[PDB]
């Protein structure tokens, strides 16, 4: 019957995801964490919103890895966050989690959030043994939400009506594709030609998109709501078989001249997991930038 | 408090609109019609769905034009449907309705559905005296829903993820812009280059889009659900101040080289009605087609 | 993946159900009917609302009974509508439909609408061979929606906040239980004691509830929106495993002193179909009325 | 146009409320707090979910009280949390906030969360000068959500289908009314008679309801999701004119033999704020308990 969604890590992102799953009645939720009892407390709190939301999703905490058994969807946020130093430690967490996925829920659809996400997703893919269409990493949905939002406020249009592509990787080497931005399905260049938005404003918006997490932390907060909603958009596309075109970290098998590595690109998410991998027909200049993102991913992969 | 939505015409489209307004809790509804008591029957039926939908919208019928008083939104579907012969008769209906709008609800936001919509909308604009940003006609949201749906089924992606533009007019001279079709924000030409869809399939989809109403009637049905949902998407964008980019019939003041006439183009719909009129930067070939659509509109305008 | 919902009968109720399923993204829909091509026309129209609704449900028509194969949910509205004369004819339709359910989708959850529903549901249960927890008839959700709505308008409270029970059967012998009416969970008698509503107003509301279909038809309309939304509330409770307490026609095995017959009572609808049959602890006066409803059901059963 | 919702206090409850308002597209949000820049960080994060949620709500932070100007709805969570010692300090915060409400948004609808809520709500009512129908305190929606949820899990029914009343005050002296609990509109005593639930289980559920916040904190968490969703259910009932029957802290003018004090009771919330105050017809035993709750409120009022 209902989907079982196990959230491996019950921190701030985990809490908002659980909240949103009950709001949308997506399925039973398990808030798993290594910290004793905390996930039970959050689960209990969150379970009462079933009344207000008119839903019927069980929300429970867990301090045991075998509660992954029966998982339809597994969302990994667990991990430590000399950033390079944390690579091996987080690799160890992916290993342990991957062994339990292979044993307890080999058919689950896996979403990795732990940073560097393009690295951690491939590690978990390797340690869990799941098919390449059943594991993705969060990146482009979150990154493009900022880009799309900022442009929509300049243009005074509904945020969803702006569409944009950010590829290669999550993080500071993300590749923003100015050429692939649209507003109500209309190329953004038309709005630049009409002076509704300038290139210089768009340049500032790009830098702000790239540095948004830093901007939030400099304001004495931490990004967890947008990330959680972006993760749930991806999870919901799988569970409801929406087949939405969402930019995620996925195994590259030749696209962009790249193989044996995970990178961000538009994919189609449906009941079969990653049903399609869409390769944008980038020019040599966008390609060069894509290469830089992949190289940084490889560099960090080599230290894990 | 709640918005008051008066539906002038309580036929099949009127019935589905009332259904959808209660489903979405948009506002109180008045089902108005010249036919005695029928709108009361439909309203009564529809009023009970408040229980199932968890909403609180009053739904009442009306056989009196002064029930337009206080209208926030007015949706006109009333009219007869030698098609040219009906022009003057439907003009007479717009006149009568327009006099009551001027008198009873001059500040209402008006959506005209009655065909030929690009003609009837301008007539009602003239007889009602409302500002040009407060009256639009249904066209492109409905026409592009077919185009977007058909392409999404070939491509196996979520229907909303395909975006397309159909301009000029509603009806057989609608202008389909192949160049402005995107899939997940990605130009459709990329999918044609990749052989995921061919030009010949797209040619068949275009003809099917243009002839969809005829196709439904040849199948012994009549199009009323899609039209109703498209009308409600437009009405909801106004009421909730969504500022969605929606293609509607609106007064052209120079765009595309055209003035003093209504034609379909992407507009932004928010709390100020038509907040923006977006002029696509068409080439001479798309422009020529746009001209043909406007000329047919003018031809029928001259017979009303 | 997605649920497959087959609507056996593609008339007015069928059309609104298909509309609501796409609105709520419930599953793929098959509009089946004996009439050539009409279900194809309605399906086509309805399929375009996927764009406006942000959903991804396939909507197709069918003139073939084997399209029931794979059905998760089957909703029967097909039938002719000297009312006693139609009993055998509608029994013949249930027979034919029941043989195809047994052959094509024996594990489907079945909702019968065809009138007299308490009769037709048992007939289809017998001819289809499905388990008693997998077949129900529409009655109390629809009947109580009117009662709950009318009281909420007198009391000026949200319609869903009024709860009421109507049992025994659908139709003119429905049993309205004044004692089981609540407002925000508070006994209705308190509001009568406070003079917020009188017994005489409630008496008029009861008669109006019983005669609502007649009232709609006397107003030159026909009840199909409320029935459709009530059917979808029931279907959605099954599909999403909501476990909502909904009053439906179900097999009585001793409740109310009655066996081997279908009658309306509160049931719990979840992933296991009818998970619970709730027997209200009626007094002898409510019981007598319940008996009269069952006797009329038996009388019509004997003529089929 | 859109409602302006000012959240005075941008902590954990404030963050979830902002999240839920964008999810439901309720209106523009201001996250106000005395802490420098933090509300800006949370607002920024939360603003990006407009893309994922298909909504268009502005979300901004504020460190200035005059941003209350134009507020339609104001939700107060600000305050320190020898508990008696904090009374005067929180009274000082209500004073300051109340002066700004009177000056900047005298027509706003106010929801107070700060504890002891039944005390703080009356203080803010007095310092802000707003009409008694325009200020309420959070209590019963939150408290009954636990009670309703726990019973629904024992009974295996949808959480919303259980309705219950907790009155008098929020906090340890809350009055749980066993007599006013229903399941699908059916008295809970019927389920006790049928042995579906026992009195002893219900006794444990009552104690758990009363001690839920303590239970969450003993589990190393803190209650903020349920409280936030309960606050939003109340705010949404006002904004959308739902007229839902919700138990809130409101000015008592004679009900239950009590005056000049705020206490929890079912109220109707619509566009006119508190449209109705429903007085339950309690017996002398429930009344005695209600008195104890009011006395504790008065005791703490006298120390502020």
UniProtKB/Swiss-Prot annotation, chains A, B, C, D:
Protein name stated in the entry:
L-lactate dehydrogenase
Which residues are recorded as binding substrate? Answer: 83, 146, 170
Which residues catalyse the reaction?
170
Family annotation (InterPro entries)? L-lactate/malate_DH (IPR001557), Lactate/malate_DH_C (IPR022383), Lactate/malate_DH_N (IPR001236), Lactate_DH/Glyco_Ohase_4_C (IPR015955), Malate_DH_type3 (IPR011275), NAD(P)-bd_dom_sf (IPR036291)
Source domain of life: Eukaryota
Q: Which residues bind NAD(+)?
A: 12-138
Source species of the chain = Plasmodium falciparum (isolate CDC / Honduras)
For the biological process aspect of GO, one term held by this record is: lactate metabolic process
